[PDB]
Design a protein around this ligand. Structure first.
Ligand SMILES: *C(=O)c1nc2c(C(=O)Nc3cc(O[C@H](C)c4c(Cl)cncc4Cl)c(C#N)cn3)cn(CCN3CCOCC3)c2cc1Br
Length: 294
């Protein structure tokens, strides 16, 4: 029996749930909405519905409620997943957000790795200026979130969604992260080791700043230009600990210009103050994007 928010309340009967998309902090199901635009009541639209699992411990609810409230106040930005509406009255809690039809950035890239009929046999779906654009968009989305004082605490390609128009949208930015209980050896459902995105001050000192998201952004950069690779590939977690303590970093990935590996290394500077800010990252990536001629 949650309170009614008229601005965000959407009739649940105007939703038609489809196939589930993924899990977590609750689950997410693809659905069709009717009249999401109040000007066109009978117009369908494909949205993503966030709801509780069948676990329903009351802190799962509180966490989803908490995420909902964050979604309400973050505001609108093209490079983050935006709230469309919520269903709270007379039924299960739904959090309706934008749907990115091409999945997350990692799945997007791995499915588009280069391959002999035709004039462009060698040409894969992914070009350098499009990879830079992906990075630049995530940077500006993160720049926005930082300005609204929203730390991500888990920034990865897995948490960056790709729309039909190849627009990068940052997801799951307003979340309870379980910061004080992280199983550093625990890999997720899709085999991800979140510890490999953690800044040293976050990993060793449990300290999160916007600069700790910058470290993660550098890891996200490595993912992009490996076309969906897993960072510290094949390296056991036990090694990652002593590896970072000795100040070691990932090598420069194949077919990656020194401009971008330089940016990566900058984001991975030990001291938070000697890392670029997202604003500086946006500008630097823009200059690269500018250098693409025509
Ligand atoms: C609807 O536009 C639509 N969405 C998807 C997605 C998809 O991932 N949508 C999506 C997922 C979201 O969060 C989940 C939990 C999620 C997943 Cl499933 C994966 N990685 C990260 C996260 Cl956060 C959110 C949110 N918030 C919003 N939208 C995936 N697909 C399938 C892509 N399709 C597969 C077959 O080849 C072509 C591409 C879709 C499809 C659609 Br229509």
């Amino acid at each position: 029996d949650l309170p009614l928010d008229p601005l965000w309340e959407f009739p649940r009967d105007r939703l038609v749930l489809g196939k589930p998309l993924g899990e977590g902090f609750g689950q997410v199901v693809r659905a069709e909405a009717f009249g999401m635009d109040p000007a066109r009541p009978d117009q369908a639209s494909t949205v993503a519905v966030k709801m509780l699992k069948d676990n329903a411990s009351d802190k799962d609810l509180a966490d989803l409620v908490s995420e909902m409230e964050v979604m309400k106040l973050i505001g609108r930005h093209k490079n983050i997943i935006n709230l469309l509406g919520v269903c709270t009255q007379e039924g299960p809690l739904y959090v309706i957000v934008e749907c990115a039809a091409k999945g997350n950035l990692r799945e997007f890239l791995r499915a588009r790795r280069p391959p002999p009929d035709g004039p462009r046999s060698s040409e894969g779906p992914l070009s350098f200026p499009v990879l830079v654009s992906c990075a630049y968009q995530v940077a500006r989305g993160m720049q926005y979130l930082e300005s609204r004082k929203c730390i991500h605490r888990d920034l990865a390609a897995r948490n960056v969604l790709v729309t039909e128009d190849n627009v990068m949208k940052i997801a799951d930015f307003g979340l309870a992260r379980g910061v004080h209980h992280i199983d550093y050896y625990k890999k997720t459902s899709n085999g991800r080791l979140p510890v490999k995105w953690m800044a040293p001050e976050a990993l060793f000192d449990e300290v999160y700043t916007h600069q700790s998201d910058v470290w993660s952004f550098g890891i996200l950069l490595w993912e992009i230009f490996t076309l969906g690779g897993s960072p510290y590939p094949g390296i056991p977690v036990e090694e990652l600990f002593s590896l970072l303590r000795e100040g070691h970093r990932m090598d420069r990935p194949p077919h990656c210009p020194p401009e971008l590996y330089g940016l990566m290394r900058e984001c991975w500077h030990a001291a938070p103050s000697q890392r670029p800010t997202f604003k500086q990252l946006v500008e630097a990536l823009d200059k690269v994007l500018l250098a693409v001629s025509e």
